[PDB]
Design a protein around this ligand. Structure first.
Ligand SMILES: CN(C)C1(CN)Cc2ccccc2C1
Lengths: 237, 300
């Protein structure tokens, strides 16, 4: 069934599961033509498939070539997403295949279900959470590898860096979703927060800065401040 | 014209014969139905005055035998039976006609309704959906579940309709997932029509039989089957032109005949709005759309 606030600890139990987010698969810029009509130009995309327990992100880059000569691209995007997820699952050894796949948008349910008919014992589930995974393209190294790709390509990252060495997956997911919520609500400020101090760096093999435990607490407080503000700035309160 | 005699009418019951019905009182001198048109299947059905639960009845074809009705006080229902002694049967019927104890199948001459509702329905196919091979006639009631219903519990008392499932391997070709889910033409024409039903007449027969069981017995699994078979056609981009024209006629007479007061339960909003307004065949069902819009505009 649907994933919500009430069955939130299930994400961190020992049954393998993946979140799939398709919000960045089909991406376009909208522009005027010489004749003063409007046209779209697609740019590279990505499927965001994440194991919330391990931090394993399977980032499937969607090259614009996949749209060439195709119609109804927003509908295809959902089916293309489901095709790629199903191919990922089949490529994994049996013992690494997920027992559940949670889609962040309900429109992915039928596409994924049809593509996974061969996997009757994999549950496809929606969620009532408003998860901020669309803001993954605000992570500079993820954005950079998507925009540079010249062909379809799968890139494997740990979205938690080394955090699990010191914190639980529950706490790591909470940190991640706070960082992404912030980046989604006010990218500039969020990015200012994360880098203001030039002495804290991002390891070559990491996505996020190498904060100490105490520095993460300050950071997290600042992200909350940002999120509460923008919410006032938005509704005037 | 043929006859279905009744031994007696010991309990107060509303009796149906095709789309007609009449009330019989406890121990009223009622001895059957005469003048039943040859050439069509028929259904004789019952709702007891005391227990409006369980509508039930019998599909039959008088060309296949001499059939009669006899109340069973142990099982407490009117049972169809076959009489194998033809002389005894002729003799029973003639006496009851002479005493005028029989109602007349009351067909208006202009009226083609029953033909139009049963055009493609054949007893031999009914008997394969309703498996009880020692009888030439078939029992159905409100409660009987379908094979597909059982897969989601007594197999002897099931309606063995053809399983249709849009999210199944039978319906979806490996590597055509999107194509086949959005355009079911493959599943309709190759899987179902060519592979399973063999021709569109057997498809329409099951469709019409499913509708009639839904209407006459409120059989929910049959209503599901009727709507699934409609939706499979309407969600196919490629349907033979002769099939669409006939579908329009079939559905038209089903909608025309449905009791105005049962549309709420017997008609699925989603299927009908999708078929008439969103599907590939949204513009291929002119008669059906016009009656639906003038009779049940609320549903849409
Ligand atoms: C770089 N990391 C060692 C990973 C890829 N080598 C481990 C793993 C496994 C599956 C998916 C992502 C990742 C990240």
């Amino acid at each position: 069934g649907a994933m919500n606030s009430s069955n939130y600890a299930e994400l961190f139990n020992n049954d393998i599961k993946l979140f799939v987010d398709d919000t960045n698969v089909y991406r376009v810029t909208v522009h005027k033509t010489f004749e003063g009509n409007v046209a779209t130009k697609a740019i590279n995309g990505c499927i965001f498939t994440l194991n919330p327990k391990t931090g394993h992100l399977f980032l499937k880059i969607i090259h614009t070539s996949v749209w060439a000569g195709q119609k109804r691209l927003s509908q295809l995007a959902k089916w293309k997403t489901a095709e790629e997820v199903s191919a990922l699952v089949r490529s994994l050894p049996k013992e690494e295949q997920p027992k559940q796949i949670i889609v962040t948008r309900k429109a992915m349910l039928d596409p994924l279900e049809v593509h996974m008919l061969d996997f009757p014992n994999i549950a496809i589930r929606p969620t009532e959470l408003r998860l901020p995974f669309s803001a993954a393209m605000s992570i500079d190294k993820l954005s950079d590898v998507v925009m540079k790709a010249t062909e379809p390509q799968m890139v494997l990252f740990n979205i938690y860096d080394d955090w699990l060495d010191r914190i639980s997956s529950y706490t790591a997911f909470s940190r991640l979703t706070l960082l992404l919520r912030a980046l989604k609500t006010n990218e500039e400020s969020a990015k200012m927060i994360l880098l203001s101090d030039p002495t804290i760096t991002i390891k070559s093999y990491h996505l996020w800065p190498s904060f100490t435990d105490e520095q993460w607490i300050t950071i997290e407080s600042q992200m909350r401040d940002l999120i509460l503000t923008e919410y006032g700035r938005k509704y005037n309160v | 014209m043929n006859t279905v005699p009744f031994t007696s009418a010991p309990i107060e019951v509303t009796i149906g014969i095709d789309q007609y019905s009449f009330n019989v009182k406890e121990n009223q001198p009622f001895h059957g139905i005469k003048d039943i048109p040859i050439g069509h299947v028929h259904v004789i059905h019952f709702q007891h005055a005391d227990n409006s639960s369980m509508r039930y009845g019998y599909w039959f074809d008088c060309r296949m035998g001499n059939f009669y009705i006899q109340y069973d006080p142990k099982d407490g229902l009117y049972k169809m039976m076959e009489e194998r002694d033809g002389a005894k049967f002729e003799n029973i019927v003639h006496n009851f006609k002479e005493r005028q104890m029989m109602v007349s199948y009351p067909k208006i001459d202009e009226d083609d309704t029953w033909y139009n509702l049963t055009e493609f329905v054949q007893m031999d196919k009914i008997r394969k959906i309703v498996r009880k091979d020692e009888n030439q006639f078939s029992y159905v009631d409100s409660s009987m579940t379908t094979v597909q219903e059982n897969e989601l519990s007594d197999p002897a008392h099931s309606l063995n309709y053809t399983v249709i499932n849009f999210k199944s391997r039978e319906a979806i070709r490996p590597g055509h997932e999107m194509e086949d889910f959005l355009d079911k033409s493959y599943y309709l024409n190759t899987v179902m029509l060519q592979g399973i039903f063999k021709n569109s007449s057997n498809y329409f027969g099951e469709l019409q039989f499913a509708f009639l069981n839904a209407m006459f017995f409120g059989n929910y699994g049959s209503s599901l089957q009727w709507h699934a078979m409609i939706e499979l056609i309407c969600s196919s981009a490629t349907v033979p032109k002769h099939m669409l024209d006939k579908l329009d006629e079939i559905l038209y007479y089903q909608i025309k005949t449905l009791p105005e007061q049962y549309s709420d339960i017997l008609l699925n909003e989603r299927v009908w709005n999708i078929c008439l307004y969103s599907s590939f065949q949204k513009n291929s069902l002119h008669n059906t759309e016009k009656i639906m819009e003038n009779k049940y505009p609320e549903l849409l």
